[PDB]
Amino acid sequence: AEAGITGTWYNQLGSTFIVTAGADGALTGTYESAVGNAESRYVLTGRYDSAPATDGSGTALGWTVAWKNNYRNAHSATTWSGQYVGGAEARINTQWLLTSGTTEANAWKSTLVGHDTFTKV
Amino acid sequence: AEAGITGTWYNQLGSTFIVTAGADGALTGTYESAVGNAESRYVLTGRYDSAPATDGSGTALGWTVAWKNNYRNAHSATTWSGQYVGGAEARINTQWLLTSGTTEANAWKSTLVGHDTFTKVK
Amino acid sequence: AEAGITGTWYNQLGSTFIVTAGADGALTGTYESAVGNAESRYVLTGRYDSAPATDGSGTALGWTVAWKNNYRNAHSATTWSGQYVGGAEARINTQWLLTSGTTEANAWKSTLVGHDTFTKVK
Amino acid sequence: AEAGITGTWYNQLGSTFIVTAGADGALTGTYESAVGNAESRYVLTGRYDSAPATDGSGTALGWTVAWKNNYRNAHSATTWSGQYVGGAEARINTQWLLTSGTTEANAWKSTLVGHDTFTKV
Ligand SMILES: [N+][Cl-]
Ligand SMILES: [N+][Cl-]
Ligand SMILES: [Cl-]
Ligand SMILES: [Cl-]
Ligand code: NA
Ligand code: NA
């Protein structure tokens, strides 16, 4: 739990996530995607449970990435919510929501949902 | 626009969201929830599009709150994903995911999903 | 209760839902959507709890509509999951998932999520 | 596409899904779970695109299971939305919503979301 979150992670699509977990619950780093209207790294900020477990539970966390950087602006943001599980093969299992900024007319179709699993391999 | 988002907002459950949108696309503030095993204010951090479209499109944003503060720890975290819509009655419409830490065994039932609409007070 | 669910309902987008709750927990009917690449009525099939709690709890139910009829085919399907709440103003509050057929490549962006509230007309 | 959906499928949790896909878009069969307040088989009903693709796309489908049978009544229902992909290893990739019937007070926490992948192995 805790510390172990810090590092570089990868998901099934090939995106790379580099985070630093601060002693008091903060998550900071950058996200470089593999899919979408994304081009380079984007900043990410999140929060995690700095005091999880002690039944074998994972550490709840979440983070956001607005898809705007110096090269692209997709006018969308993705939030990932999930939990970290350490061990010989640590992983972060997540479900995410991607909302695009639409006009009212298209508001009903503004959010996509998916799931991503990150490993350090 | 940072300015339109900065403020105090409330949702249909009676929770309070105090946020500051920074120039670099950052969102920081505190959240006071009306439901859950929550007690006091919790810190929030998020991001938004500081350069949205010039179209009456909303401004996409998102934020996270881990439900642990000096008084309580619920071992869970919620992320809200949605868009800010300004005008005379500005709203932030979101969909959220609340994940609880669990054992591998109960992981299938670790995430709740819902939706909240926030109204700005000013 | 089958009876309270049977009827014509409308949601905030202007779509029509005509359903019949059968005694065995089945839901059949048609859906007329206001949005999407939809044209005419589409068939729906679902299930509900024919024996809910005796608690002012809602009655859980869910249904599916594949967006293909004799006039149009959108290669997508939506499932709504929610509960029926009876009273003077009966509502069915749902959360939905709309999945489109895609190539492995775009599969990550194949599902949309939202929420609809239906009001019964009678 | 089409036909290939008919059969017995299994997901990662061990639940078994037995469906029949009808020529015009119907899905009928039974679901026997591995998790929850479930006990035996439950009836399922759904719909699928009987005319998908012709770019290599999967077949969109969805189905519902109300968790009430002659032995248990969990006062909940689950809907799975996803697409079928055939081939040497056919699979159905889904995201699901599980709603329990609550009082208004707990309505905010009535729906769980997850994802399941079914294979015939
Ligand atoms: N999403 Cl990645
Ligand atoms: N859920 Cl299976
Ligand atoms: Cl809240
Ligand atoms: Cl609709
Ligand atoms: Na809340
Ligand atoms: Na609709």
Name the one residue in this structure whose structure tokens are 């994802």: D115
Nearest to D114 among B13, B108, B114 (CB): B108
> D60 and D87 in contact (C-beta within 8 Å)?
no
Please tell me if the CB atom of residue D34 comes closer than 6 angstroms to any atom of ligand 2. Answer: no
Query: What sections of chain B are H helices per DSSP?
Result: 2-5
d(CA B72, CA A4): 23
Ligand 3: centre distance to CA C80 (Å): 23
- Characterize A3-35 residue by residue with b for buried, 16 or more Cβ atoms within 10 angstroms of its Cβ, and e for exposed: eebeeebebeeebbbebebeeebbbebebbbee
Nearest to B52 among A45, A93, A101 (CB): A101
Note the residue count of chain B. 122
The neighbour count for residue B64, using CB atoms within 10 Å, is 30
d(CA A107, CA C1): 33
**Method in brief:** X-ray
Nearest to C108 among A35, A108, A109 (CB): A35
Residues of C in contact with D57 (CB under 8 A): 75, 101-103
Residue B24 carries which DSSP code?
A: T
CB contact under 8 A, D47 and C49: no
Ligand 6: centre distance to CA C13 (Å): 7
For C89, the token pair is 């103003």
Please tell me if the CB atom of residue A61 comes closer than 6 angstroms to any atom of ligand 1. Answer: no
Q: Which of D79, D94, D96, D113 to mutate to test the interface with A (most CBs of A within 10 A)?
A: D113
What SS3 class is residue A10? Answer: strand
> Given phi > 0 = left and psi -120 to 50 = alpha, else beta, which region is D81?
beta
Ligand 2: centre distance to CA D83 (Å): 16
Closest among B26, B9, B34 to B94, alpha carbons compared? B9
For A75, the token pair is 């006018």
> A27 and A63 in contact (C-beta within 8 Å)?
yes
Residue type, B20: T
Q: Where are the domains of chain D?
A: 1-121
> Given phi > 0 = left and psi -120 to 50 = alpha, else beta, which region is C40?
left
The protein residue whose alpha carbon is closest to atom 1 in ligand 2 is D116
CB contact under 8 A, B109 and D114: yes
Dump the DSSP string for chain D.
Answer: -GGGG-EEEEETT--EEEEEE-TTSEEEEEEE-SSSS--SEEEEEEEE-S------PPEEEEEEEEEE-SS-EEEEEEEEEEEEE-SSS-EEEEEEEEEE---GGGGGG-EEEEEEEEE--
Q: Is B48 annotated as a binding residue?
A: no
Question: Which residues hold their Cβ within 5 A of ligand 3, which is an ion?
Answer: B 15, 33
d(CA C47, CA C27): 5
Closest among C14, C71, C12 to C38, alpha carbons compared? C71
Which superfamily does B1-122 belong to? Avidin-like (2.40.128.30)
Which neighbouring-strand residues pair with B7?
A: B19
D54 burial type by CB count under 10 A (0-12 exposed, 13-18 middle, 19+ buried): exposed
d(CA B85, CA C4): 37
d(CA B86, CA A104): 12
Backbone dihedral angles phi then psi of residue C78, each to the nearest 5 degrees = -120, 140
d(CA A89, CA C114): 35
Nearest to B111 among D35, D108, D112 (CB): D112
The protein residue whose alpha carbon is closest to atom 1 in ligand 1 is A116
d(CA D14, CA B63): 35
For D95, the token pair is 């995201």
Task: Tell me the nearest-neighbour CA distance from B103 into chain C, angstroms.
Answer: 26
Please tell me if the CB atom of residue A116 comes closer than 6 angstroms to any atom of ligand 1. Answer: yes
Task: Tell me the nearest-neighbour CA distance from C32 into chain A, angstroms.
Answer: 16
Which superfamily does A1-121 belong to? Avidin-like (2.40.128.30)
Q: What is the resolution of this structure in A?
A: 1.6
d(CA B84, CA B94): 9
Closest among D11, A84, D12 to B99, alpha carbons compared? A84
Atom of ligand 1 nearest to the CA of A78: 1
**Three-class SS of C78-108:** EEEEEEEECCCCCEEEEEEEEEECCCHHHHH
d(CA B117, CA B94): 6
Task: Tell me the nearest-neighbour CA distance from A109 into chain C, angstroms.
Answer: 6
Task: Tell me the nearest-neighbour CA distance from D107 into chain C, angstroms.
Answer: 9
Dump the DSSP string for C55-80.
Answer: SSPPEEEEEEEEEE-SS-EEEEEEEE
CA C121 to the chain's CA centroid: 16
Spell out the residues 6+ positions from residue A88 whose beta carbon is closer than 8 angstroms to its own.
none
> A35 and B53 in contact (C-beta within 8 Å)?
no
The neighbour count for residue C92, using CB atoms within 10 Å, is 27
Neighbours of chain D (3+ CB pairs under 8 A): A, B, C
Residue A13 carries which DSSP code?
A: T
